[PDB]
């Protein structure tokens, strides 16, 4: 799995702004996407019991349960993952939501920094799976998938514009960070035409 | 005298190499970088039983002051391995790719004297030795 916690990504980023191969070696978390876990029903039952386990376990109170549930609904995200997000960040009102975007924010940024900034062993390491290149287009599509609008339409009645704008901001920046990454790759000069055609289609 | 003379440098290199990666980035050109660091090979060999054993006996037989330094390195080395043993097994190993972990634990956890000796070390006033000795038992448990 991947560390759902925001802090490691933040610290690693500051390091580069020092780079420790050890933390970086943690590596693939810079997937970008949270492809594998979406909202899970199976995960809900585990959560509702108020006992959850992480990939030790913790007792989960009713209040926390609700915050976790809101997250799954809001971001079509797995319930357990949503939990790790809350644990990592100080529990305050929708703190998990913040960690969710923050986790993505620096991960994208780090990839951006490496690919753009560095010429280097690590640049080679990140690219070498040739996991990042595959994911880049999909990451973009992930942003695109209409989740926000449907909720708004459903929402129209008791609308909550403010929370929505918050999400919209994080996503837009993500797309922007994604732009740098794609550009950086070009400078990096991956292999060939197949990508361009796919991209043109995309 | 010659024995310790050679042993010490190797331990120092050993320790450095372990440090020679930043594990926290993951915990908190990537593939290539991960291939290149010496940490990978170091862990690989450390797992070998002549390697771990030799390191372990240094701990068993403790105390010139020079010899004492060798002891400190021995402990610190083991602590680092334990701390990131997991990282190697699951993070690092697959990236490059050779063989698994188990032999090391039985030698450490089951050898009793090592456990006893470390316990005895906590009392010692070298703080590096004592502080680290304390940590190891924690990781082992």
Swiss-Prot record, chain A:
<protein>
    <recommendedName>
        <fullName>Nuclear pore complex protein Nup205</fullName>
    </recommendedName>
</protein>
<comment type="function">
    <text>Plays a role in the nuclear pore complex (NPC) assembly and/or maintenance. May anchor NUP62 and other nucleoporins, but not NUP153 and TPR, to the NPC. In association with TMEM209, may be involved in nuclear transport of various nuclear proteins in addition to MYC.</text>
</comment>
<comment type="subunit">
    <text>Part of the nuclear pore complex (NPC). Forms a complex with NUP35, NUP93, NUP155 and lamin B. Does not interact with TPR. Interacts with TMEM209 and MYC.</text>
</comment>
<comment type="similarity">
    <text>Belongs to the NUP186/NUP192/NUP205 family.</text>
</comment>
């Amino acid at each position: 799995s991947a560390a759902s916690l925001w802090g490691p990504y933040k610290d690693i980023w500051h390091k580069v702004g020092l780079l420790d191969k050890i933390l970086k070696k943690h590596k693939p978390d810079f997937i970008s996407l949270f492809k594998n876990p979406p909202k899970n029903v199976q995960q809900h039952e585990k959560v509702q019991k108020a006992s959850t386990e992480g990939v030790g376990t913790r007792l989960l109170p009713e209040q926390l349960i609700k915050e976790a549930f809101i997250l799954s609904d809001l971001f079509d995200i797995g319930e357990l993952a949503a939990v790790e997000l809350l644990l990592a960040g100080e529990h305050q009102q929708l703190v998990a939501v913040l960690l969710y975007w923050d986790g993505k924010r620096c991960i994208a940024n780090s990839l951006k920094a490496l690919i753009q900034s560095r010429r280097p062993e690590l640049a080679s390491m990140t690219t070498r799976f040739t996991g990042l290149t595959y994911k880049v287009l999909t990451l973009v599509s992930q942003i695109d998938v209409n989740n926000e609008f449907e909720k708004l339409q459903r929402e129209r009645g008791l609308g909550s514009e403010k929370h929505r704008k918050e999400v919209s901001d994080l996503i837009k920046e993500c797309r922007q960070s994604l732009a740098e990454s794609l550009f950086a790759w070009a400078c990096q000069s991956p292999l060939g035409k197949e990508d361009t055609l796919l991209l043109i289609g995309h | 005298a010659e024995k310790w003379e050679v042993a010490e440098v190797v331990l120092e290199v050993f320790y450095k190499l372990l440090r020679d990666y930043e594990p926290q980035l993951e915990d908190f050109g990537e593939e290539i970088i991960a291939y290149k660091p010496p940490g990978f090979s170091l862990m690989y060999h450390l797992l070998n039983e002549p390697m771990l054993e030799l390191a372990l006996s240094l701990l068993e037989e403790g105390v010139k002051k020079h010899l004492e330094k060798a002891v400190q390195h021995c402990l610190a080395l083991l602590n680092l391995t334990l701390q990131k043993e997991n990282l190697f097994m699951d993070l690092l190993r697959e990236s490059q790719l050779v063989c698994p972990l188990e032999q090391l634990l039985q030698g450490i956890n089951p050898k009793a004297d090592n456990v006893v000796n470390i316990a005895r070390y906590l009392y010692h006033g070298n703080p590096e030795l004592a502080f680290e000795s304390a940590k190891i038992l924690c990781c082992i448990s």
